[PDB]
RNA sequence: ACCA
RNA sequence: CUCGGAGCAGAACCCAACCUCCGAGCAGUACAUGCUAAGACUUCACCAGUCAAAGCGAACUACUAUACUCAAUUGAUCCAAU
């Protein structure tokens, strides 16, 4: 109710907008200075001798001989290794939430990158050293639904926070290779290969992975009760019984350790143009796919 | 550079903690034996000196 | 510096940088102090303590440092259990 | 569904069955419900929020008797009019964390009371100031003039 | 005193604290040249990580 | 013994 | 040819000279000359250099002490030895 229309009804009595009458927002084109004329001719801003003005001063760092500032620092492994460290994006329970509220994130479903990652809730750069994604408790005061989510890393507070709600939550490994798969599926099933299997984690993952604690994905599920109810106590909250829910099978759902996406075996090949599923069925392909 | 009255020594600790420090020390002197305050085992306890470091 | 590589055509890294210096996030540079390894046997405790610090660098060390190193030193990293983590964002800073 | 030689049904065999993880052990310590839980946002110069549990220390069973007799004595200045034990935790930004806190605290009272504790802990410094403005004090305590 | 507050004065027992001046601090510089890493421990809030936008 |  | 003290340069600071003078490239005591941390100084930049409450550990009842006497008494990075 005004402007909006009061220049459209404006542009009626005006000449025709055409190829002759356009012109660029002032301020969007900033003159070009060229070395013509008293101001900018003569010596052009460059001064007068020198190695300035001749174009030939020494490199950036350089001091005039002085043993520069960026030599003479020690050598110190502040970036030693950066290249190879492992690094996750931090999902919120507060963006992880809003997720939700907005639609984005199912919670009626299991909830791993590939939901997060269409739901454009979180960015995942592979080629960056992202080994996936970080749960963190940032917003676990306000944090109501309940879920069954996999994640790669996650606080006590924020696993504290989705057990109290009645939801799950596991930690699983990916590797480089396998992260950019279940990130970015349509592109892998685009290159005609076989589903590959997930790797195990090395060594030194090995142990946060086989911890009821982390609540790994490798862990004693016998174990997990206790550690389950050992938050509970350390928290203040009552420990629900997920096994009386009626989404109790949803919120059991777990991939297999060598398996990529629900329901989807390692050795299958997407043919996305036909929307078929092909399975090899040679006995060493077969043993080897499921090894 | 010739002429040279003290000389750098490692202390190392008595206490097998591998707490070691250096001090100074006439040359002609006897090896030191210095009761020193060890952090490891937050306490004090002898030292032997081991090594020349170097000539002062 | 190479403002323009031969084989990319593009701007290269001074690795000396890389090796000395720590860039935050925020924009600053984290350096150890030069001689904290040298001589410590004439050196005062207190001398020995202000060599062992981490400190920062001014503006134009920050400046020449940002020149030095291309943008992939500059993205926000999320290294697991990052010493510096806390020390990427500033807190209360006006002006 | 697929399942690899790495199945938990594999790695774990006695371990088997979709409840085993989920189960709720049947072998109830401090009763949530006993507690008063209350959260207040403390200044909030301060980001911390404030957690704050009150519990009526007599009435309460779950304490052992003995103990809720030693409790009232080494905290004192904790109850209140009405023989609340009121304890706070404003050290977190998280409610949950503040909470676990005041609830450590509570599980810390009890477990101090049962052990009681003869050891001779070193004198603090503001003991020993008390220590001789007390002794200064039972010697100007005078006698009855006939006894 | 508690007994004199509580049942003669009957009223809640006032407690009080010795309460010392906050610290002071310099104004916060954009560039802290030549301060140690922990100066910025000294204008920060709060211990616990915190993340933004994520 | 004597590289920086 | 580096570093200190004095004059020039009288009184906050700074101030040149193939200017005027005199010095230093150590000794001695310790063995907490251990740790840590507010706030500051600063040789006109930087680098380097300096002083320090509180705290933790110690020490401890009559100048000493969580930072020895002393003016300088000194050498970055890389690299090497371990």
Redesign the interface.
Known sequence: QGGGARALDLLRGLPRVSLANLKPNPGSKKPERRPRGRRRGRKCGRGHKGERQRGTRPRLGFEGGQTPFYIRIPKYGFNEGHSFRRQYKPLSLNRLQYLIDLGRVDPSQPIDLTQLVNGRGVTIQPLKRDYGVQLVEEGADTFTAKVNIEVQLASELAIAAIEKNGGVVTTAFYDPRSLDIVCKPVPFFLRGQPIPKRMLPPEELVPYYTDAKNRGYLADPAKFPEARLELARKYGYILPDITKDELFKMLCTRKDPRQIFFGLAPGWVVNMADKKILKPTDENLLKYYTS | KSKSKNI?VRMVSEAGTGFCF?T?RNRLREKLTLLHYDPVVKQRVLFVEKKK?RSL | LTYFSARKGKRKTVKAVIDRFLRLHCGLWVRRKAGYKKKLWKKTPARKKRLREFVFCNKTQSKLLDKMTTSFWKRRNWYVDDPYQKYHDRTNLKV | EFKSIYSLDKLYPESQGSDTAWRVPNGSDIPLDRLTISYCRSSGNKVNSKAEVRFHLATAEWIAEPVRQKIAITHKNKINRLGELILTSESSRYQFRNLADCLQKIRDMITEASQTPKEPTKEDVKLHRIRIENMNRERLRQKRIHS | VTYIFHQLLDMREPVFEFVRPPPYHPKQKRFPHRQPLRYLDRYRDSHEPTYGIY
């Open positions: 750098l250096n100074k470091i």
